[PDB]
Coordinates of N, CA, C and O and ligand atoms in Angstrom, one line a residue:
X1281 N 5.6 3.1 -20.1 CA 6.7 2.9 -19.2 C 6.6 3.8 -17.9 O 7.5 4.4 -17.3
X1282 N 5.6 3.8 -17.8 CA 5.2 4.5 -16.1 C 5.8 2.8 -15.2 O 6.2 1.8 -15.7
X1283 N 5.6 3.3 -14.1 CA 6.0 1.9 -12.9 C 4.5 1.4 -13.2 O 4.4 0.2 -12.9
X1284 N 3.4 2.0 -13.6 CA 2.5 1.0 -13.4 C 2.3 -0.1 -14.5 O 1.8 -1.2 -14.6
X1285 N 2.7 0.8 -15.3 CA 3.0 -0.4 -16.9 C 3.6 -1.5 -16.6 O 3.4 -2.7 -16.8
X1286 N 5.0 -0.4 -16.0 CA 6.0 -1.4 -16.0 C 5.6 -3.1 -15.4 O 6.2 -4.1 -15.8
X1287 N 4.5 -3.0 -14.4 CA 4.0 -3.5 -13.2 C 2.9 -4.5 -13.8 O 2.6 -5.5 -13.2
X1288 N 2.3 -4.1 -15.1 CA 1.9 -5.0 -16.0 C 0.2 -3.8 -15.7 O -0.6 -4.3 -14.9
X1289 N 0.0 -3.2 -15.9 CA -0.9 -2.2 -15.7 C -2.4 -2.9 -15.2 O -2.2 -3.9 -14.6
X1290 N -3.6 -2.6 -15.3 CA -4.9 -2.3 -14.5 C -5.1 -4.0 -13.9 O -5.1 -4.3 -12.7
X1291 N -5.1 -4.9 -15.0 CA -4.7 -6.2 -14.6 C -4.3 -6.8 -13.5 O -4.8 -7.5 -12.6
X1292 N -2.9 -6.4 -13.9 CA -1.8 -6.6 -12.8 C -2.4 -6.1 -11.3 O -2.7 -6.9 -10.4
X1293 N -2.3 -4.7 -11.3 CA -2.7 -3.8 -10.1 C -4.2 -4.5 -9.1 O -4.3 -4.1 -8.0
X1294 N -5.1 -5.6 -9.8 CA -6.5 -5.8 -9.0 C -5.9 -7.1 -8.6 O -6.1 -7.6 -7.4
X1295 N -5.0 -7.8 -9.7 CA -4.6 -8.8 -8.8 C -3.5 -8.4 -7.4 O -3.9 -8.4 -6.2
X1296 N -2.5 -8.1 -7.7 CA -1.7 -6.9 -6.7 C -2.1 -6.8 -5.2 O -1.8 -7.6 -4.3
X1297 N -3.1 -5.7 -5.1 CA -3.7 -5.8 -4.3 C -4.1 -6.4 -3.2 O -3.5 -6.5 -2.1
X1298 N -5.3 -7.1 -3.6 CA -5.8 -8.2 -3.0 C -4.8 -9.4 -2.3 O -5.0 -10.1 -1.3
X1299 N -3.8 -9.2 -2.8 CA -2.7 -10.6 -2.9 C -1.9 -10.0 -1.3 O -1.8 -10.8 -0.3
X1300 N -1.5 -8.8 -1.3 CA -1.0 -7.4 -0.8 C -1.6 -8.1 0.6 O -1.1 -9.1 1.2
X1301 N -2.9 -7.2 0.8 CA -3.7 -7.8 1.9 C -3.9 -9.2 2.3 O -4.5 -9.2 3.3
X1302 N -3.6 -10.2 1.8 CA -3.9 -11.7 2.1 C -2.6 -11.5 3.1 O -2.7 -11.9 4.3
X1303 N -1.0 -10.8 2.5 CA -0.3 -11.1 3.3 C -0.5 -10.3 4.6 O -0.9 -10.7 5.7
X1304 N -0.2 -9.2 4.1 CA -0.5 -7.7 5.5 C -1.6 -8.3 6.7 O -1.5 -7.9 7.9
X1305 N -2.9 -9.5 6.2 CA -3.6 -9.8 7.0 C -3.3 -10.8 8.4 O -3.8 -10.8 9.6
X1306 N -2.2 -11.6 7.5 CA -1.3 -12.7 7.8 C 0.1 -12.1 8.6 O 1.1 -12.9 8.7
X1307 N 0.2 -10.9 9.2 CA 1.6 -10.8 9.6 C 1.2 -10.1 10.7 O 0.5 -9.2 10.7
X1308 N 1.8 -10.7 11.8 CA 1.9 -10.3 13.3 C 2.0 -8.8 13.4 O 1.4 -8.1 14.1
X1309 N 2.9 -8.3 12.6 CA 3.1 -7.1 13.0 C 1.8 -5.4 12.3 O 1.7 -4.2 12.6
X1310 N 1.4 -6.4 11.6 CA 0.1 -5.0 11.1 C -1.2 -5.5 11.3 O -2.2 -4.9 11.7
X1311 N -1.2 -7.0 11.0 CA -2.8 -7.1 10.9 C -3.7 -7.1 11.2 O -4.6 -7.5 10.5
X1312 N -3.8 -6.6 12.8 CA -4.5 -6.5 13.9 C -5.0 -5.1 13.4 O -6.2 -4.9 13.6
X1313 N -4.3 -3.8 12.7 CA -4.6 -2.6 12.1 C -6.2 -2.6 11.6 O -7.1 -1.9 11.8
X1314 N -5.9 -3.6 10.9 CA -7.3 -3.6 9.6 C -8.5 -4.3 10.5 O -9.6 -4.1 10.1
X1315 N -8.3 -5.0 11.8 CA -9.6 -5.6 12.0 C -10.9 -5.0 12.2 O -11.8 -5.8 12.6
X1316 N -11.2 -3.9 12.2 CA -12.5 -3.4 11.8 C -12.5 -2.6 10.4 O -13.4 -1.8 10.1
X1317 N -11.6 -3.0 9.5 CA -11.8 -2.3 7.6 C -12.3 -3.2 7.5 O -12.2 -4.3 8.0
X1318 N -13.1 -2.5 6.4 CA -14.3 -2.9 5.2 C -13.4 -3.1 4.4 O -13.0 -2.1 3.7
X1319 N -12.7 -4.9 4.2 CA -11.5 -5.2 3.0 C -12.0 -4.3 1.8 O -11.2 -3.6 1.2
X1320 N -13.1 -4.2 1.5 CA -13.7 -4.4 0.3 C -13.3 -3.1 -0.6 O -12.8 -3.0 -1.7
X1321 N -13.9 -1.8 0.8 CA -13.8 -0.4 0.4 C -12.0 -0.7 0.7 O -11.4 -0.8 -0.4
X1322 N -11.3 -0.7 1.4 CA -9.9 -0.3 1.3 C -8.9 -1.2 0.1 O -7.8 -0.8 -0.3
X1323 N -9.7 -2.5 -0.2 CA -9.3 -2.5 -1.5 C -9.2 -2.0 -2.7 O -8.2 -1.9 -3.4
X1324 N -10.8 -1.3 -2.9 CA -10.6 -0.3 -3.9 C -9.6 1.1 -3.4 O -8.5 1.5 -3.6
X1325 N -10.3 1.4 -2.9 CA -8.6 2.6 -2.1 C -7.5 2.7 -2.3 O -6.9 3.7 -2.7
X1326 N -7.0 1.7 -2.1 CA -5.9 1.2 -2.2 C -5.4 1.5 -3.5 O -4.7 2.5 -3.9
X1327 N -6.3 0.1 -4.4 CA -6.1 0.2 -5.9 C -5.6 1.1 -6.4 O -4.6 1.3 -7.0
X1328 N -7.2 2.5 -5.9 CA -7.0 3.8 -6.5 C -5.6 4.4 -6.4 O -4.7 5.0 -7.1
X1329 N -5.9 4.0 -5.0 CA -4.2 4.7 -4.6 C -3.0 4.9 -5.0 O -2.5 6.0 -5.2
X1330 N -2.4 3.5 -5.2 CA -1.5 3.2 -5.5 C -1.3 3.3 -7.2 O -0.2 3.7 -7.7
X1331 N -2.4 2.9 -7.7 CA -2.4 3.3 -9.0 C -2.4 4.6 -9.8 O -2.1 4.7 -11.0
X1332 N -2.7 5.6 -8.8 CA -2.2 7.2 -9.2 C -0.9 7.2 -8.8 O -0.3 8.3 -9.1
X1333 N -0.1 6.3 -8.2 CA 1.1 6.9 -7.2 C 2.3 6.5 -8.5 O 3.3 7.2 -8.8
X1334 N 1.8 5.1 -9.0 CA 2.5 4.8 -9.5 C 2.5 4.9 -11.5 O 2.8 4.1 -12.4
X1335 N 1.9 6.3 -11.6 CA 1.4 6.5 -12.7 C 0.4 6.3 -13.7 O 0.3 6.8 -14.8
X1336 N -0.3 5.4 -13.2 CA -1.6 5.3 -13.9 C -2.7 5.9 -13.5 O -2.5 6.8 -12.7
X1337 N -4.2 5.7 -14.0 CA -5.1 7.1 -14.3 C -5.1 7.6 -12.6 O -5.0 6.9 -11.6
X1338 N -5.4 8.9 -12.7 CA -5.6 8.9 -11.1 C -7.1 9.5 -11.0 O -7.4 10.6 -11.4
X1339 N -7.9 8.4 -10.3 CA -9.1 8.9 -9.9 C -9.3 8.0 -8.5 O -10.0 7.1 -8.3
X1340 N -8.1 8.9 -7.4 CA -7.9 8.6 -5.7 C -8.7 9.2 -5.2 O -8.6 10.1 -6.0
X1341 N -9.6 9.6 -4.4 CA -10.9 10.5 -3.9 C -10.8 10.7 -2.8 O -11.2 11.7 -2.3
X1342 N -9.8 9.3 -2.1 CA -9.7 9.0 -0.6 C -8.7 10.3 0.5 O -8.5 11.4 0.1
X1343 N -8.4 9.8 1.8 CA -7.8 10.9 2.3 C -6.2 10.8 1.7 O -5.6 9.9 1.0
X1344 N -5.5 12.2 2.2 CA -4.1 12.2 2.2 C -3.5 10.7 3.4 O -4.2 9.8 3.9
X1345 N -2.2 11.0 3.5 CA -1.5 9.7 4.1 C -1.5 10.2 5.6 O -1.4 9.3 6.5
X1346 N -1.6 11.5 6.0 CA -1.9 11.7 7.6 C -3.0 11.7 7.4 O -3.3 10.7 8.1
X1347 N -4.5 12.2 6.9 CA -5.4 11.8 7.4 C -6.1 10.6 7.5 O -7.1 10.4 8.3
X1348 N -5.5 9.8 6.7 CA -6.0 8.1 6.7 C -5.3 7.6 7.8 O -5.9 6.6 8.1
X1349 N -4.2 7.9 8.6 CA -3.9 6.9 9.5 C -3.7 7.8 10.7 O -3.2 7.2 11.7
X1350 N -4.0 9.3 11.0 CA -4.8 10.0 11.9 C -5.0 9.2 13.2 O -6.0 8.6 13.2
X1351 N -4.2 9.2 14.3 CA -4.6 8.6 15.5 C -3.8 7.2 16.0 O -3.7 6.9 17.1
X1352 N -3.3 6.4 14.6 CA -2.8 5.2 14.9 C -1.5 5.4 15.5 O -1.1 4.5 16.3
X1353 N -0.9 6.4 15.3 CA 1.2 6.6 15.9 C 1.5 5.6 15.1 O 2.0 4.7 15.7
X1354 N 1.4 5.5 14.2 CA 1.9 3.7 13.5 C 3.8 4.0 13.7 O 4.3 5.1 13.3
X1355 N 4.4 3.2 14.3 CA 5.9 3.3 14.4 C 6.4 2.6 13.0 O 5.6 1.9 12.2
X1356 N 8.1 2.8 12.6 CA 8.7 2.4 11.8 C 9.0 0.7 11.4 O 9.1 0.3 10.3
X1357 N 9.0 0.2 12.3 CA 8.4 -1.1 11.9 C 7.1 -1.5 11.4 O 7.2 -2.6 10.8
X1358 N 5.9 -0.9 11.5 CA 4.8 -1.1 10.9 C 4.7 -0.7 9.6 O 3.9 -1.5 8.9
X1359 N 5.5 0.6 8.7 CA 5.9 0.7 7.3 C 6.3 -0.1 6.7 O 5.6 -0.7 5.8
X1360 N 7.9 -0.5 7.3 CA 8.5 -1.7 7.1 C 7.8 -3.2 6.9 O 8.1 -3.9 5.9
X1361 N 7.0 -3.4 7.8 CA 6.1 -4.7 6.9 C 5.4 -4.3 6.2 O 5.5 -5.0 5.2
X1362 N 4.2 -3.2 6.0 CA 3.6 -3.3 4.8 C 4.7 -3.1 3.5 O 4.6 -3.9 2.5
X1363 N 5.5 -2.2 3.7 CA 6.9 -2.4 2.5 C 7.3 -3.6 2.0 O 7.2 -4.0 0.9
X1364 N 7.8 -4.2 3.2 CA 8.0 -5.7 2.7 C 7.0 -7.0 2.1 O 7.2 -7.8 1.3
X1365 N 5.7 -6.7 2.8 CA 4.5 -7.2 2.1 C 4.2 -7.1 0.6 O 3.8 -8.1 -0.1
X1366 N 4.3 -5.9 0.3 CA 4.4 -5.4 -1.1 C 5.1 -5.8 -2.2 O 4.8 -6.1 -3.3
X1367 N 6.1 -5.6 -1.8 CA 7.5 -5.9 -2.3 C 7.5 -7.7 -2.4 O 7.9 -8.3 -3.4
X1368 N 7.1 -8.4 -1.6 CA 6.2 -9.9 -1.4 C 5.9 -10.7 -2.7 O 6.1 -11.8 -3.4
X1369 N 5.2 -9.3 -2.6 CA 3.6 -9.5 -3.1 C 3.8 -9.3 -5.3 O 3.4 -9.8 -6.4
X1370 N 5.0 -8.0 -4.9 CA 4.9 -7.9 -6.6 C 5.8 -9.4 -6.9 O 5.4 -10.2 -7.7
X1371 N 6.9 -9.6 -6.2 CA 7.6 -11.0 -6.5 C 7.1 -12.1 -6.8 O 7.4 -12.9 -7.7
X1372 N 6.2 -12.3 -5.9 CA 5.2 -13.6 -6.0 C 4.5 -13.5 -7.5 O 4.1 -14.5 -8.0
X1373 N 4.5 -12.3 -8.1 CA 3.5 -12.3 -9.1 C 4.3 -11.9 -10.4 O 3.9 -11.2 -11.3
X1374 N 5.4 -12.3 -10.3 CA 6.9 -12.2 -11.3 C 7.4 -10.3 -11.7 O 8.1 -10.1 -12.7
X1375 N 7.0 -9.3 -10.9 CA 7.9 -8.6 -11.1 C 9.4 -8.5 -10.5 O 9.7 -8.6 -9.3
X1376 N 10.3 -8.2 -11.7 CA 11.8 -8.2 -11.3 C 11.9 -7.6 -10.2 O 11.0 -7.1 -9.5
X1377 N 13.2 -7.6 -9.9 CA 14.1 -6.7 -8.3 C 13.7 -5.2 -8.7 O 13.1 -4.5 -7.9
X1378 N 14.3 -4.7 -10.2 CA 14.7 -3.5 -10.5 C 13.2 -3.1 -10.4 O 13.3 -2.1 -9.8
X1379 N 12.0 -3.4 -10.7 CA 11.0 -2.2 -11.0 C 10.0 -2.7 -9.6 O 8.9 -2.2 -9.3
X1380 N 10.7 -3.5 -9.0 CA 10.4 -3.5 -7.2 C 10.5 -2.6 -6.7 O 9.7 -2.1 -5.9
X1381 N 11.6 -2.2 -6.9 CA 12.6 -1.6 -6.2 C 12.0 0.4 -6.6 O 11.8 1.4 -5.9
X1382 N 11.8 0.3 -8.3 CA 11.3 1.4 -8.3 C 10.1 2.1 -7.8 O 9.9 3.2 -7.3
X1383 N 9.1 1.0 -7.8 CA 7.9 1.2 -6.8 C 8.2 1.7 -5.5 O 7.8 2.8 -5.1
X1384 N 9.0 0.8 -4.7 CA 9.2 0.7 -2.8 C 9.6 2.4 -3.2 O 8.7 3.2 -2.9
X1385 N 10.8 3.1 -3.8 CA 11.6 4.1 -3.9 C 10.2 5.6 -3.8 O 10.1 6.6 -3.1
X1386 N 9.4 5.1 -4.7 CA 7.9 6.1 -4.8 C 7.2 5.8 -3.4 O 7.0 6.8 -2.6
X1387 N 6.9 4.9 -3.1 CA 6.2 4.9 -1.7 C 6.5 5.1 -0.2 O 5.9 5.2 0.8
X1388 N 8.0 5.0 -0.8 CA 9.0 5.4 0.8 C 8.5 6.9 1.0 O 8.4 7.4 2.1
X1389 N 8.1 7.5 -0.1 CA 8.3 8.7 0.9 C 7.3 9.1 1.2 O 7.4 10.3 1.4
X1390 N 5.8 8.6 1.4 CA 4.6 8.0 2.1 C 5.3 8.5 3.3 O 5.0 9.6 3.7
X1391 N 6.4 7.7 4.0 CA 6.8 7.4 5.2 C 6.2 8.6 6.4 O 5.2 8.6 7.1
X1392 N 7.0 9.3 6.1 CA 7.2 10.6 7.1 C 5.5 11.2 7.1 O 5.1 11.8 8.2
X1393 N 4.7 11.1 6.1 CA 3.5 11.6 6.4 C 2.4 10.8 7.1 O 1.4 11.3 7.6
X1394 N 2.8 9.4 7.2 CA 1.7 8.6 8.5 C 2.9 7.9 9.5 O 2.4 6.8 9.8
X1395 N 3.6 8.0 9.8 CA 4.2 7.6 11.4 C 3.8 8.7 12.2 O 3.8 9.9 12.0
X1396 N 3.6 8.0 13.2 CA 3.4 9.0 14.8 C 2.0 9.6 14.2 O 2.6 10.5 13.6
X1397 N 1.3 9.8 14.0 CA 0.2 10.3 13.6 C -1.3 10.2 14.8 O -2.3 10.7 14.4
Ligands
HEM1796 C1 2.5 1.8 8.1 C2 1.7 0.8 8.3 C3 0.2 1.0 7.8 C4 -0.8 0.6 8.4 C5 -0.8 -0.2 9.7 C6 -2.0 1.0 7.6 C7 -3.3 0.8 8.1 C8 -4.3 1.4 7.5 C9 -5.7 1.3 8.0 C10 -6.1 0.4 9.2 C11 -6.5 2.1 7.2 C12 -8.0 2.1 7.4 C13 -8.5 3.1 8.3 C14 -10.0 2.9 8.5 O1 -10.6 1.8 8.1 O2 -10.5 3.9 9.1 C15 -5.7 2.7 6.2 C16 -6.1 3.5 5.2 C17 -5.3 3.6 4.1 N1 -3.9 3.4 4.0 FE1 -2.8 2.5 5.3 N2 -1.7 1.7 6.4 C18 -0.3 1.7 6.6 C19 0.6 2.2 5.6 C20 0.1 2.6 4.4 C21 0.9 2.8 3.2 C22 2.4 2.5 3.1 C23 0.1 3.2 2.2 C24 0.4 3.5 0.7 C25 1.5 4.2 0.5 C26 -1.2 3.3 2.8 C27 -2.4 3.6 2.1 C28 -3.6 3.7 2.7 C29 -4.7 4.2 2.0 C30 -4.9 4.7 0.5 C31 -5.8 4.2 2.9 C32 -7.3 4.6 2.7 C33 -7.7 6.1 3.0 C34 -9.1 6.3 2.6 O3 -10.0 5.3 2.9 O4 -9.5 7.4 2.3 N3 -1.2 2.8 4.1 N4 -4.4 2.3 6.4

């Protein structure tokens, strides 16, 4: 009963992902971000990422949340879609409102450490 259980655990999380980015790739307002990432490595990244954030094993290697977006200024609308992407993305893939909601709640506070950056 971590959020990542909750979320249907290691399974869940590879499909997640990938699904994540199909949208984020697809939306005017971020996708232009990623066009020189290596999907591949920021998929695993990600994975890692997210998957320590949200209680499962943590072996994240990558940078903190200002040093990974270092230089971008990403503004508050650009959170906001990958947020809503997310949130998308667990729906599409049948998790409920409530352990949506518990996720978005852990990652909001991401926020303040990559805007304006
Ligand atoms: C706010 C809008 C965001 C945009 C536009 C964005 C975009 C990016 C981009 C383009 C990179 C790759 C940098 C590179 O290839 O040099 C990156 C790295 C990453 N971002 Fe984001 N990101 C955003 C929000 C987030 C959020 C909300 C999270 C999770 C809470 C996150 C987690 C990561 C992680 C784990 C990395 C990899 C760091 C590493 O490779 O060591 N990002 N992000």
């Amino acid at each position: 009963q971590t959020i990542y259980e909750k979320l249907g655990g290691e399974n869940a999380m590879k499909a997640a992902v990938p699904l994540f980015y199909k949208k984020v790739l697809a939306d005017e307002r971020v996708k232009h971000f990623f066009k020189n990432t290596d999907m591949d490595h920021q998929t695993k990244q990600q994975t890692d990422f997210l998957t320590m954030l949200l209680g499962g094993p943590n072996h994240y290697k990558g940078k903190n949340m200002t040093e990974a977006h270092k230089g971008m200024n990403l503004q508050n609308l650009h959170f906001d879609a990958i947020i809503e992407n997310l949130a998308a993305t667990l729906k599409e893939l049948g998790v409920t409102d409530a352990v949506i909601n518990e996720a978005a709640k852990v990652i909001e506070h991401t926020r303040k450490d990559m805007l304006g950056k």
